[PDB]
From a paper:
One of the hit compounds, [name] showed robust (~80%) inhibition of rabbit [name] at 10 µM, and did not appear to have any selectivity for [name] over the closely related TRPV6 channel. In order to verify that the newly identified [name] inhibitors, [name] and ZINC17988990, bind to [name], we utilized cryo-electron microscopy (cryo-EM) to solve the structure of rabbit [name] in the presence of each compound. We were able to resolve nanodisc-reconstituted [name] in the presence of 10 µM [name] or ZINC17988990 to 4.3 Å and 3.8 Å, respectively. At these resolutions, we were able to clearly identify that the ion conduction pathway for both inhibitor-bound structures are in non-conducting conformations. While severely limited by resolution, the [name]-bound [name] structure was still able to give us some insights on the interactions between this novel nonspecific inhibitor and the [name] channel. In the [name]-bound [name] structure, the density attributed to bound inhibitor is located at the interface between the S4-S5 linker of one monomer and the S6 helix of an adjacent monomer. Two additional densities appear to bracket the compound and, given their characteristic elongated shapes and their presence in previously reported [name] cryo-EM structures, they have been assigned to lipid molecules which may be involved in compound binding. In order to functionally support compound binding at the S4-S5 pocket, we tested the inhibition of [name] on the M491A mutant of rbTRPV5. This mutation resulted in a right shift of the inhibition curve (IC50 = 9.08 ± 1.45 μM) which suggests that M491 on the S4-S5 linker is involved in [name] binding and inhibition. Unlike the ZINC17988990-bound [name] structure, the S1-S4 bundle appears to be occupied by a lipid as seen in other TRPV channel structures. Rather, in both inhibitor-bound structures, this econazole pocket appears to be occupied by a tightly bound lipid molecule.
Residue numbers in the entry:
A (entry chain C), B (entry chain A): 29 to 65, 72 to 224, 230 to 637
Write the structure that this text describes.
């Protein structure tokens, strides 16, 4: 954890303090090293050249390298810093004379430094790989990368987690150094670099997509863009799509780019060469499958509710000689569901309900292991809080159907719950309407944004005031003042008086204790005037602030539902995307053109 | 008061008008003073050189100083202006030749001017101390402070209220003169200046903290910041903390900086060298003590409410031969609380309630005299309106427990009130939740921002309309139209009809007077359509305006609760902050490092 780097840094400062060699190296004097005139480690992995290269002392570097020739060719102890080449340390400080003298001594330019501070991790800040070439090409030393590649410093290589120098240069906050170094490393390759995967299994194109570097994405696209006729204003250009649509792999680029946990992947979809394709797909074959499947799901759910509304009956058997026993029906035995001939179609409806539940479970069971569990449960782009309520509705319908087949009493307790869950399951289908798009995404944001806070602050006030009212009314007879008879219905009545549905409990034939009157007068201005209206104002404030993000999230999830319902249906029905090129002689590469106007 | 300075200024203008000496001094002519050719006061403390230095007349200054040599070495009458050195007057106007000629005459450069217009007070505007060196170093005369310190003008000194020249230079709206003069006065010190307290008892570091001058705080910190290895992008720097964490004094710097009445002390906490420390403390040992103490307080309060819900009973003794007598229970004698064996644990619960009240009173009794009464009662950072309701709940539980032990009738009147107060006391514990943080601070701002105004304007309308309805319904029999029987329940029914809980009083078997109908139709559109909705809109407007301040206030109070629950618990459990330096040889100075990235 993070009480480790401080301790080893203080120990390293102790070890540079005590020994006069490294202390004079940090001092960079004249009559120190010659007056003294080696392979001893520091606190953890540091020789004499390391602190000299770290504090940029050229004369000390030259004096030590002409004193001991073998000392530059020496790695460090590897407990917090594996390898720790002096070249790799000095290239970050970027001294021309120092890197030239180090290559004159001829250090191992193909070294490897998989240190504990050298890893793609949220602990460290920099992620620079484990190579001096990667260090130079990510810092931006354009005059030094040529001297590094002069001695052939392994233009293709792996490291810890096995990515490459191009992925290192991509995964970086961009600048001019990034684009110039990308062009440089692409030129100095002389299939071998743009095609190599990693141990995460990604093409550099797809890794730039899953990160979100839009300018690197466009500068990689612009090397694969052939131009047709350009008549004045309008320009008809062409794009390649064999990277953007693999259609034979495990994870497509369009499917992977929507599934990241990073909150910048969604902005990649408004760039042209994926936006035109997804808008063509959504204008032709997105809606005329989604809407008809939604209509069939509407018909299935209304068939389920009109089948469940005809629940069978039996009259009462035991008497009700206690005045609060109103149970006028009961559920009869299993033998009489097939006795009446006006219920065979009702059993057919129960069969189609349980068949729909089984088929939706069998569809969604492989849909749980494609990308991660939190990638499928909480990503509002893919629709997590619709998936969980769909699978809960399916499992509860299965449980209540096997309870019906086992013929036990009290079946309505899963029935009403599964019925309201399956009917609110329709709200997933509000992605194919321009009106119904942002409103559901607003309510999905709004629940876990503020209704959680409002319920968490309402609960303590209501739990206080219900107990207060019950203490003040336990000395009161309940046959006239009906409310607050026992404690749970007092809790419920206070909840209702909070949300102002029920009227205030008042009988105008007798007198009421004044403590109730003063406490209810306090409760009115602490609940109904204040907190409900403040909740309304707070949700108006937060709607004013995140009205910007809803349309971007809606575009992200419509591209998500297009790629999901492209992957799901078999390829006998969905067309092959784009136009083929074998009838025009380019050869087995599908292509697309856009007609822009600059 | 403020009808004093005007009178003495008019008298001073009278005294410069009447005497031709000072009038020619203000005139600055040639053939006036030589044609006339002294120690007479003005209206209150003014000789001839004072008005000359005040109106910047160099030839008059030279002529008077070569006429009378002793006259420059002369203070003034001290009733509104004590001392009033001519050097101290002239240094504000900042004339080089005049200050050089005054030092050539050799005035008392170590003078002292504790005038009525010279004090740290909200009456005056400038607070410049009582020294010419302080005057020069706060004005910004960088070419004149050297000539002042040339004759050794007491680089360390006190004044009225006993602060120093460095505190004078700190307590000022900053500019370039301030930072350059701070560096100058630190250099010209040759433990003696950075360590001296005042008669308020503050180090200059702590006084700059309690004022709020962030740039002076950082320029004082930057003289105590040693730098470790700087490898390219990332930089590992070190801070000293023996000023920021005294841990042996009466008032720590972090404890004092949150307790000021100034509304700029809260912005100091987003500066790095205190922010990293308080975030480390809140991430390690802030929440895992606060949350478990909150859970134990939740358990104590729910034990209190489940003990109070089992209030003992006795049936009615006197009959109810009047139709509005519903009192079906009564509180029995003290002898039967220990009669039943199903109430010993209830008496145990009453004992733990009164023990919790006694222990919370014994904890909060020394917490009332640490910083001031209004510093502890109204500062929303420290939590005043939670402290007062906690101590009120404790005192009222003590009163109702001694009333139970004395066995008097009518005990529920403090019981319900203390119960609702102790249950709303949980709302203090919404500081350790990122969701529950700003919402409670919004409601605490909102009550005393606008609900006061809305209640103050609602009261007069409701007091009018209740009297109107009661006058119109005193000619009506109450056995059918139950509402508005007597005046207080008419007041309450109008309050309820304002806040729209109860429905409108209507019986559809008889007729009602038309004055009621027209007045209730006026009351509807003057209350429910208009004023409730306008209150909703006003609180939405003010939420839109002070949505900015809530997160800053929340950061301020989380640093406040960290320093308070660091000071409160004994030091056997809380760790010593930071890392020690004796095992690394620096010596008895705890230190901290930060890993920034520029
Ligand atoms: C929208 C959803 O409808 C419900 O209320 C249904 C049930 S009723 C319930 C009753 C007592 C205790 C927990 C319940 N929970 C339900 O889910 C809903 N809205 C909200 S807002 C804040 C919460 C919450 C989160 C964590 C713990 C306790 C409450 C919440 C919630 O749990 N559900
Ligand atoms: C939030 C608090 O709950 C209460 O109402 C409880 C009691 S009822 C009451 C009845 C008649 C007269 C005074 C009362 N006071 C209470 O405190 C609360 N909210 C507000 S808004 C404006 C005021 C206010 C301030 C100064 C004088 C009169 C009223 C106020 C208040 O005093 N208390």
């Amino acid at each position: 954890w993070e009480q480790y780097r401080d301790r080893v840094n203080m120990l390293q400062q102790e070890r540079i303090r005590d020994s006069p060699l490294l202390q004079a190296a940090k001092e960079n004097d004249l009559r120190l090293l010659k007056i003294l005139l080696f392979q001893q480690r520091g606190a953890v992995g540091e020789t004499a050249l390391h602190v000299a290269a770290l504090y940029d002392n050229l004369e000390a570097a030259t004096l030590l390298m002409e004193a001991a020739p073998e000392l530059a060719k020496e790695p460090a102890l590897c407990e917090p810093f594996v390898g720790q080449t002096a070249l790799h340390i000095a290239v970050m400080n970027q001294n021309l004379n120092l890197v030239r003298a180090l290559l004159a001594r001829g250090a191992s330019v193909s070294a490897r430094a998989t240190g504990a501070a050298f890893r793609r991790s949220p602990h460290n800040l920099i992620y620079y790989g484990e190579h001096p070439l990667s260090f130079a090409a990510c810092v931006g030393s354009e005059e030094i990368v040529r001297l590094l590649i002069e001695h052939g410093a392994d233009i293709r290589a792996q490291d810890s987690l096995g990515n490459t120098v191009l992925h290192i240069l991509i995964l970086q906050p961009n600048k001019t150094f990034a684009c110039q170094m990308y062009n440089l490393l692409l030129s100095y390759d002389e299939q071998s670099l743009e095609l190599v995967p990693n141990h995460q299994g990604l093409t550099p194109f797809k890794l730039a997509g899953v990160e979100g570097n839009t300018v690197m994405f466009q500068h990689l696209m612009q090397k694969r863009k052939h131009v047709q006729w350009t008549c004045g204003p309008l320009t008809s250009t062409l794009y390649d799509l064999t990277e953007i649509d693999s259609w034979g792999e495990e994870l497509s680029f369009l499917e992977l780019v929507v599934s990241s946990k990073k909150r910048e992947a969604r902005q990649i979809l408004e760039q042209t060469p994926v936006k035109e394709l997804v808008s063509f797909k959504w204008k032709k074959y997105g809606r005329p499958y989604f809407c008809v499947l939604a209509s069939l799901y509407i018909l299935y759910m209304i068939c389920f509710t009109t089948c469940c509304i005809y629940r069978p009956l039996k009259l009462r058997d035991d008497n009700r000689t206690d005045p609060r026993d109103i149970t006028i029906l009961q559920q009869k035995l299993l033998q009489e569901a097939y006795v009446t001939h006006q219920d065979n179609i009702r059993l057919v409806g129960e069969l189609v309900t349980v068949t729909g539940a089984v088929i939706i479970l069998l569809l969604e069971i492989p849909d749980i292991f494609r990308v991660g569990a939190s990638r499928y449960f909480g990503q509002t782009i893919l629709g997590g809080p619709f998936h969980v309520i769909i699978i809960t509705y399916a499992s509860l319908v299965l449980l209540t159907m096997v309870m019906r087949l086992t013929n036990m009493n009290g079946e309505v307790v899963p029935l009403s719950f599964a019925l309201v869950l399956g009917w609110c399951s329709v709200m997933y289908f509000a992605r194919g309407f321009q009106m119904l798009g942002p409103f559901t995404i607003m309510i999905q944001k709004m629940i876990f944004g503020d209704l959680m806070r409002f319920c968490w602050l309402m609960a303590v006030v209501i739990l206080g005031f219900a107990s207060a009212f019950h203490i003040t009314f336990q000395t009161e007879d309940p046959n006239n003042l009906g409310e607050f008879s026992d404690y749970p219905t007092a809790l419920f009545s206070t909840f209702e008086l909070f949300l102002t549905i029920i009227d205030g409990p008042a009988n105008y034939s007798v007198d009421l204790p004044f403590m109730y009157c003063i406490t209810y007068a306090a409760f009115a201005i602490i609940a109904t005037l204040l907190m409900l209206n403040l909740f309304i104002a707070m949700m108006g404030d937060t709607h004013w602030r995140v009205a910007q993000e809803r349309d971007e999230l809606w575009r992200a999830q419509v591209v998500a539902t297009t790629v999901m319902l492209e992957r799901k249906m078999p390829r006998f029905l969905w067309p092959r995307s784009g136009i083929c090129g074998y009838e025009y002689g380019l050869g087995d590469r599908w292509f697309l053109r856009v007609e822009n106007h600059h």
